[PDB]
Design a protein around this nucleic acid. Sequence first.
RNA 1: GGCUGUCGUCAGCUCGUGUUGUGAAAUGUUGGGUUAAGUCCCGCAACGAGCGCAACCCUUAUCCUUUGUUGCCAGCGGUCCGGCCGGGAACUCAAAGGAGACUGCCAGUGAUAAACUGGAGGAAGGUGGGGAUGACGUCAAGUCAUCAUGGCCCUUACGACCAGGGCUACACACGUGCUACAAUGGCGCAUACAAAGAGAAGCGACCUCGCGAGAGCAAGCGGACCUCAUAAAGUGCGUCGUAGUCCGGAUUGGAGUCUGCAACUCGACUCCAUGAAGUCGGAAUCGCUAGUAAUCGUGGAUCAGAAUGCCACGGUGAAUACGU
Lengths: 105, 127, 98, 96, 206, 150
Amino acid sequence: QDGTFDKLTKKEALMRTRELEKLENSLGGIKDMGGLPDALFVIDADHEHIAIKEANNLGIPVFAIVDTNSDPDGVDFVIPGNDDAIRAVTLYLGAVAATVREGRS
Amino acid sequence: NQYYGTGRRKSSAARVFIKPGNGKIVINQRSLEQYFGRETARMVVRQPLELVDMVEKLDLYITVKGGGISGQAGAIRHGITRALMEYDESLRSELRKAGFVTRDARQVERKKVGLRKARRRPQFSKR
Amino acid sequence: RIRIRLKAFDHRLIDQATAEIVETAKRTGAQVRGPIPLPTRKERFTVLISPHVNKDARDQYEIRTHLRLVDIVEPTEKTVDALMRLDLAAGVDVQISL
Amino acid sequence: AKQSMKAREVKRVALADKYFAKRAELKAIISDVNARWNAVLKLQTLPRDSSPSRQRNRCRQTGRPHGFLRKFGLSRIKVREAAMRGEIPGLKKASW
Amino acid sequence: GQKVHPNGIRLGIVKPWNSTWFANTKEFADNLDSDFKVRQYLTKELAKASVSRIVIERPAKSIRVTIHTARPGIVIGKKGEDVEKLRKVVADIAGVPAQINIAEVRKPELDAKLVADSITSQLERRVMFRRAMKRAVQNAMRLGAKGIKVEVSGRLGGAEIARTEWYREGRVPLHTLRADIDYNTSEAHTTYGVIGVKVWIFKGEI
Amino acid sequence: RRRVIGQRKILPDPKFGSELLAKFVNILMVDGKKSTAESIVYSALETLAQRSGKSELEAFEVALENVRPTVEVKSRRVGGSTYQVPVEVRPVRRNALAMRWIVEAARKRGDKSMALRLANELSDAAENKGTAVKKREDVHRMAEANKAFA
RNA sequence: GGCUGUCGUCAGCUCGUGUUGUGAAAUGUUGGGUUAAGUCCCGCAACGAGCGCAACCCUUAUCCUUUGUUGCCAGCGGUCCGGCCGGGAACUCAAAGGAGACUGCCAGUGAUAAACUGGAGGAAGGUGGGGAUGACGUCAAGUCAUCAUGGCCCUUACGACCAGGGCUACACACGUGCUACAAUGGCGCAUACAAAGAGAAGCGACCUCGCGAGAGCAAGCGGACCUCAUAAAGUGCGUCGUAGUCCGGAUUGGAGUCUGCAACUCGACUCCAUGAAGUCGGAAUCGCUAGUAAUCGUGGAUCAGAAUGCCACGGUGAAUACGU
């Protein structure tokens, strides 16, 4: 707001802003605080085994809805749910959101 | 109204007349057949002029001191397009958008201090 | 109505160019109003001698120059036949500005 | 240092800097031959270490007879090692 | 060595100059000779002065030389008598009352000349240099100046072979003009050959 | 490729049906120079009778018999690599390929305008001159000289 | 030391953390497109960063803010018909500052993505056209003969001043460019044909002769004001129709002009004589990507003086790039 706008240049500044817009869009929520998550709610295991492996290495419990054909060893809170039926996963995320919203008493 | 205008190409300085009538054409004390008909410069020095109003239809008492043969052609084109503004005051946009007042790239590029042609290896390719 | 963006070059040239630039533009008929007292002014290219961290010093070349106020209305043929045929005043630039 | 040793051309075209600028117009008869000054014009033979004909592209850095320009006395071949100094108006290396 | 001197490249930037001005076309030789004489003869006798920087400028038949010192103790000397003597010497050489000015400087951390001199002295002290190199780098980083590079020549011990090391750490954008980078190489005549040390400091931005 | 397609149909010349004259300059069209050649052919042939001593009616194609090639270079992929393999000159490239390289060296070779170049360079063929004839002397290098490998 | 050539304006060289492997190591930087590309984006156990590239630098492709002296002379007075004076600074030209090209947009190909393509907008379509920017390295590369520089000699000296020559001399060969080998040219006649530059120790306006060289006289300027400077290949006019040629100009004298005290070896330039080899050049080979080749000259720096070298400017002006 101070230097990039018009202090030095605009065309180069415009190109720089256009390039950095995608970076700004990325990390929308994780950029709020210092991170250090205490849990995770990944929607899949085989597709996103990297997150589960990282959590296991760091000892972070994972409440993942493991797929019927994924590896349940990584997830300590395996939930025999489903990955298709977008309505079902929407209902699950809505339910967990409702529970966490009132979880602070 | 008397449509006068200079125009140039490569730092030329011409005196371009455009008025109704005046069939005689004096292009820097030359002859019509010597620079615009039945000779080497019959049409090459008027290629852009084909698109614009024909030269024969408009008198040209031009003392063009500047530019090559194609340089003279471009200077005449620039002079006429910048001189008939009185004839059509709106051409400042029309001709602007018609690519007629623009300094055509069909010329030796303006250069800093540089090579013989400033775009390629000169005729001493040996290194 | 007449402003001049004088380009200063040196002191030896300016010493005579302060007046000799237009001294030959008026003999008997020109409308020039003569020299003006012209208090001290600093006019030169948009270049500084040595810009440093101190942004208040704004060091610049000091040259004594005088802007032209010709404002002729009806010069005679002979009075201005040599308006620019001057043998002195190395630095000349009559940059009138409406 | 070596600057003084290789300053042979420094003192050869310096004394006459302003010896003719204001004299040629007034003394054009002497300056221009009215032909033949076979004697007066030959007096330059006596000085064998400094004369207008002895100009040899003054270069105190190396003393060679190369590398001078009356307009500004700027490098023309040393630019290869001083191309970033900005002292190259008019004449520059021919690659473009 | 395809590199170029950053100071020469910084001629068109606000950083101090060494020889640049506009004047008459018939006074180049004498002016250049006077500038060379004052520059050469104003630093040879300043071995113990440890002056941070002396700059001579001749914009238009005017001298505005500026002097910045590093350590007041090593430059005051005998109540500044040597300073007055040098001022008189330069004034009589130039023939005009030069407006000499002295500006105090401190914090001998980000100064390229001082760190280079310290490195050369330590090398001449017959002690290890890599530890000194790392110490200088970390000291420079501690006091700001996010970006620094160092380099030393070879000729170690009784070996004719030479090696070059940099151990760069930080930002040293030489190619970009807007970097206000500082550099001043130094040399030391050790027991075997001469060892040269180069330092580049990137002290922030404009 | 399994099948091959022939040349694209092109209308003839209403004036005299001179395909050679049309192909001389059409392939070389640039900067809208077609009008120059169109206005120059008639003007040149009007005075060429005295300019060169012959009229461009029957002598315009009397020194071009050797132009017609018998073997032409064709980039054919055989043995896993490109090769010439000079085959009989098919109508697709027998004349078009040779015609496209005639004004490639007689374009601005000593005149400020193409007013007299095009006509004169071809009229000079009657006096053991020109360049369109010698062009055929280069194709023989790769033909009838490497029959062992071709 | 510094600098330069070399791969090489090539797309490159590494690191921090993380991950895989007992480990050396690998990934990042292996893939797709842009492709000039570690530029960019996408996918991706990788994420980011430090150097290189791109743009950030200069010029140019349009217009605008500001502006007219000498330069242009739209309009006004005649025209000292060249626009000369005022005058307009519309405006050619010029600059103190900008925008306009930035995948910006329509549609399609393409994994929807990236990217590409067809189209449109605009002077400028996929860095709009050129440059400054040469990495880790690299070769005991070259440079101590540009300078400095460790070591190796000596200072009545392999130190130097002066006076002739030599780097251009020949017995030949090689590398480069120029001249040509012409009639797409040569002759004289009429004809409008540039710019960047350079210059009070200078060009030298003009005036007289020299076939000319240039000399006797000479304003001008501190240079948008005075000179180089007229342009050339070109066209119409008569010419030879390929003539060892009016081509080509070396080449062996004279008459001579100037630069320089003095120029055969080692100055330039002009006229007469010189009309040779060479009539497009084998084995072959090299340079060429749009103003490209191809050319035509113009000058500037170098200049006591001595370009076919080098630098700089214009005049004109095509095809080949399907393809790995």
